Homo-oligomer: A and B are copies of this chain.
Amino acid sequence: MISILHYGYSFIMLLGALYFYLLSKDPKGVPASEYLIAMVIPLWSGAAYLSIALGQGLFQYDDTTIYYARYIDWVISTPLLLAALALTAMFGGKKNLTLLFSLVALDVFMIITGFVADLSIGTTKYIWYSLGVIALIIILVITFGPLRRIALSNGTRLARHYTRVAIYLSALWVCYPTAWLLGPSGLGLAQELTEVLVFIILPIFSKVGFSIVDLHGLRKLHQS
Contacts and interface: CB of A to CB of B under 8 A. Distances in A.
**SS of A interface (majority):** helix
A126 to B, nearest CB: 12
Interface in A53-108: 54, 56, 96-99, 101-102, 105
Contacts of A44: 109
B101 A56 contact: no
Interface size class of A (residues with CB under 8 A): 20 to 34
Interface string A109-128: 10001001000100010010
Given A51-B116, A109-B47, A116-B51, A102 B36 contact: yes
A3 interface: no
B33 A127 contact: no
A97 B32 CA distance: 10
A102 B120 CA distance: 36
25 contacts: A31-B98, A32-B96, A32-B98, A32-B99, A33-B97, A33-B98, A33-B101, A36-B98, A36-B101, A36-B102, A36-B105, A40-B105, A43-B109, A44-B109, A47-B109, A47-B113, A47-B131, A50-B127, A51-B116, A54-B120, A54-B124, A54-B127, A56-B116, A56-B120, A56-B124
